[PDB]
Amino acid sequence: MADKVLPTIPKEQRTRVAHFLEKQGFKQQALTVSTDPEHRFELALQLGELKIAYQLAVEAESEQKWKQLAELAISKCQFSLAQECLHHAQDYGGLLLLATASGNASMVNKLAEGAERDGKNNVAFMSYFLQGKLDACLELLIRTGRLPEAAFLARTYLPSQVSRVVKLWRENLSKVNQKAAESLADPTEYENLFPGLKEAFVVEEWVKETHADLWPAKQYPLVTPNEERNVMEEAKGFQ
Amino acid sequence: LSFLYLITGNLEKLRKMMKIAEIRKDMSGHYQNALYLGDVSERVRILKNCGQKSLAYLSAATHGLDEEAESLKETFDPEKETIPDIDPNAKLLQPPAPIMPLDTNWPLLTV
């Protein structure tokens, strides 16, 4: 009966009543009438026509929508898309949590790009590492003035930037003269670098490694490939 | 300090520390223990924070252990239905094979 009336209601009317309908709990039906982007939106949150919600979003026109929505999407476990929205949002933090949990390089490159974006030094490093990229970690340091720290990495996992880097750090120190403050040596004397001969470089292990990076470590797994990184690793690594 | 420990090419100290801060709660931090590692135990805890078998699967599958994550997931009345890219594809690799150190201890000189 009402439907005959329905033509003979418009804009705003629909809204009020929609709220009534919503009160009725005739959410779907409430959806059908739906009439305000906001109105549609909130209801949409309740409702979850997911795709449908997207169309309403269309171009959302507010990350806040995406943020709100992201939580919702994620709940529905409509991730493929969620990723698209979140990505669309480029809302890195939550998105990272998923991306990381299954794992992914690709995410990492784009993200790397992002990593560059973020404005505090630390996250970006994990990324660089995570990717496996000393190089990236070290380059990053150059901008931030992480210098003592950069040396440790450069030493540990040797890109022998310890030599290069140390000179520069030392130079800062140098600026701030005093001989102790200057501090000096790479192959020999103070440090014996390559003459010490101990644990962050060489070819053979490295060759084995070269491959290693390429295969999946294995134990028993899924399509989501292996790498391990534990006891075993220590042993071969020494070899 | 943990960072120093992972920088260096050795494994325990971070792990006790990991215990002792895991043990001091967490929602975003477990991550620290996992990467340089393969294996994590965090997952036992983690699932409890999540507990949607989702995290548990994503994480799970490779030790050849996707499976328990599914068992619960089913029990619940599952809710997963779509996923995004993420297939383990970034390198947790680097650190210190023989010749050209670590640095537990770092020598220098005033000279």
Numbering used by the authors:
A (entry chain C): 605 to 843
B (entry chain A): 703 to 813
Question: How did the manuscript describe this experimental structure?
Answer:
Coat protein 1 (COPI) coated vesicles function in retrograde trafficking between the Golgi apparatus and the Endoplasmic Reticulum (ER), and between the Golgi cisternae in both retrograde and anterograde directions. Coatomer (the COPI complex) is a heteroheptameric protein complex, consisting of α, β, β’, γ, δ, ε and ζ subunits. Polymerization of coatomer at the membrane assembles the COPI coat, which recruits cargo molecules and membrane machinery to the assembly site.
From 1733 vesicles and near-complete buds we obtained a structure of the leaf (representing one coatomer complex with two Arf1 molecules), the asymmetric unit of the COPI coat, at 9.2 Å resolution. In order to generate a complete pseudo-atomic model of the COPI coat, we performed rigid body fitting of the available crystal structures of COPI components, including our new x-ray structure of βδ-COP, into the structure of the leaf. Flexible fitting was performed to relax the structures and models into the map and generate an initial structural model for the assembled coat. Our new structure shows that γ-COP interacts with β’-COP via a highly conserved interface in the base of the γ-COP β-sandwich subdomain. In the new structure, the β-sandwich and the platform subdomains of the β-COP appendage are clearly visible in the EM map. The platform interacts with the trunk domain of γ-COP, whereas the β-sandwich forms a conserved interface with α-COP including both α-COP β-propeller domains and part of the α-COP α-solenoid domain. While no electron density was visible for residues 151–175 of δ-COP in the x-ray structure, our cryoEM map of the COPI coat has clear density corresponding to a longer helix, and we modeled residues 139–165 of the predicted helix b into our density. The N-terminal part of helix b interacts with the β-COP trunk domain, while its C-terminal part interacts with the peripheral Arf1 molecule (βArf1) in the triad. Our structure suggests that the main interaction partner of helix b is Arf1.
